[PDB]
Structure formats: C-alpha cells, structure tokens
Symmetry: C2
Subunit: 110 residues, 2 copies
Amino acid sequence: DARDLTAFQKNILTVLGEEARYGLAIKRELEEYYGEEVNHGRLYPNLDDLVNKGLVEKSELDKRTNEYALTNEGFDAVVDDLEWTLSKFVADADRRERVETIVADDAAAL
Amino acid sequence: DARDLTAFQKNILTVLGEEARYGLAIKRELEEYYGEEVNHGRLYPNLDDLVNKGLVEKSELDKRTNEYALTNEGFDAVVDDLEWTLSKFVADADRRERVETIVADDAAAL
Ligand SMILES: [Br-]
Ligand SMILES: [Br-]
Ligand SMILES: [Br-]
Ligand SMILES: [Br-]
Ligand SMILES: [Br-]
Ligand SMILES: [Br-]
Ligand SMILES: [Br-]
Ligand SMILES: [Br-]
Ligand SMILES: [Br-]
Ligand SMILES: [Br-]
Ligand SMILES: [Br-]
Ligand SMILES: [Br-]
Ligand SMILES: [Br-]
Ligand SMILES: [Br-]
Ligand SMILES: [Br-]
Ligand SMILES: [Br-]
Ligand SMILES: [Br-]
Ligand SMILES: [Br-]
Ligand SMILES: [Br-]
Ligand SMILES: [Br-]
Ligand SMILES: [Br-]
Ligand SMILES: [Br-]
Ligand SMILES: [Br-]
Ligand SMILES: [Br-]
Ligand SMILES: [Br-]
Ligand SMILES: [Br-]
Ligand SMILES: [Br-]
Ligand SMILES: [Br-]
Ligand SMILES: [Br-]
Ligand SMILES: [Br-]
Ligand SMILES: [Br-]
Ligand SMILES: [Br-]
Ligand SMILES: [Br-]
C-alpha cells in the first residue's frame, strides 16, 4: 500500500493524476508547487522507484523523452489519500461548503 | 510556506484539521492511517517541529495530558495542500462527480 510514500513521491502521483506527462513536464509542475528548483538527480530516481512499485508506467516515446502515467494502482493511491484527507477535512458544514466551492471552481476553470 | 513538510508532518496536520487532539489520540489516528505502529519518538519530535514552525499549538491539560491544535497558519497549510491536490484531481466532469460524492458521503456520516 502506498500510504508510506514520501511527500515528493505522492506529489509526483498527484501531478500524473491530472494527465500523463513527460519527465521534464513533471519537473516543472513540481517546481511550480514547491516554488523552488527540483534537481534531475532527485526527480528521476523517485520516478524509477514509483515505476518499480507499479504505481507509474514509463513510455519511451523518443530518446531523451519519456512519458509517465499513473497505473490503476497509482490512481488508487491518489484516490485513497484524497479520501482519507477529505474524511478528516470535511468535519462540518462550513468545511463541506469550502471543499464544494473548490471543486466547482476547478471544474468551471476546465 | 509549509509545502516542504514531510508526509508524516502533513499527516499530523490533516489529523488536527479534523479537530484538536491529545498526543496519544494523534498517534492512533496515524496508526489507523498507516496500518503500522507509530512510535512515540517519531510523533513527538515532529509535533515539536510543527509547533516551532507555528503550524500547531500545544496546551497542557488537567484531564488527560497534552492537547494539540492547528494554528491559523496550520489550517492555511492544510487548505493550501487540499486546493493543490484538487486542482490536479478535478480534471474532467467524472473526477468532479467523484469528489462531490466523496464529500457528500463524508457529510452524511457526520
Ligand atoms: Br506502494
Ligand atoms: Br516525506
Ligand atoms: Br519529501
Ligand atoms: Br503528503
Ligand atoms: Br506533458
Ligand atoms: Br517538456
Ligand atoms: Br538521475
Ligand atoms: Br517504453
Ligand atoms: Br516525437
Ligand atoms: Br522528458
Ligand atoms: Br494498470
Ligand atoms: Br486502495
Ligand atoms: Br490528498
Ligand atoms: Br478514508
Ligand atoms: Br459548521
Ligand atoms: Br454537513
Ligand atoms: Br471552513
Ligand atoms: Br453550502
Ligand atoms: Br467557501
Ligand atoms: Br512552515
Ligand atoms: Br515521511
Ligand atoms: Br482527542
Ligand atoms: Br496525550
Ligand atoms: Br503518546
Ligand atoms: Br487519548
Ligand atoms: Br484509514
Ligand atoms: Br504552543
Ligand atoms: Br491534500
Ligand atoms: Br492550487
Ligand atoms: Br465539469
Ligand atoms: Br474518476
Ligand atoms: Br446516511
Ligand atoms: Br442519509
């Protein structure tokens, strides 16, 4: 089970939950999240880890260019954590309203 | 900015987002999440870190032992992470419906 992944690894899965992405695209999505540079030497060993764990699939479209996507197991890991997080966050009606507004605004911005 | 916290520290904040809790209660909420024992020596040094970071506040009680709660900044950190997670997860209408259903079912259980 994926509840023991690092925050960095979990953030990779969150990025790929949006859509499959090239490795370099994952890097810049994480940099936008952290507000700090993400080194290749940290990203790609962690991607390899997630592939070995069966949570991410790697596709070598060309040389130097790899595309990564969640497996169903990786998607389950994303949903599992989101469900646990929401189980704790939705503690009353005000919390429910906040989350519902976040979701509706995100869907409207698609 | 608390986006650099470890997953363990972020999970502490998630637990306290549900409600203020005694230290021992935090530990069992984390153990139910992880499905493994959480040692005293992992929990309390990290509670200390979160207090020093201004994300958690501590109160010594006369009924049990010690109660921890999110500060305003700690709540902001939980909301911020949830907002980012949802910004990636709510990627089409089906994802929107899934989260709406998670929230609705969590609210029904209150
Ligand atoms: Br795993
Ligand atoms: Br971590
Ligand atoms: Br990390
Ligand atoms: Br995390
Ligand atoms: Br891409
Ligand atoms: Br790219
Ligand atoms: Br590397
Ligand atoms: Br391939
Ligand atoms: Br090509
Ligand atoms: Br790439
Ligand atoms: Br699969
Ligand atoms: Br699962
Ligand atoms: Br989550
Ligand atoms: Br859950
Ligand atoms: Br309320
Ligand atoms: Br409610
Ligand atoms: Br609220
Ligand atoms: Br409402
Ligand atoms: Br709101
Ligand atoms: Br911080
Ligand atoms: Br951790
Ligand atoms: Br409690
Ligand atoms: Br306690
Ligand atoms: Br304890
Ligand atoms: Br207790
Ligand atoms: Br659980
Ligand atoms: Br304090
Ligand atoms: Br989250
Ligand atoms: Br966001
Ligand atoms: Br939609
Ligand atoms: Br879905
Ligand atoms: Br019901
Ligand atoms: Br009902």
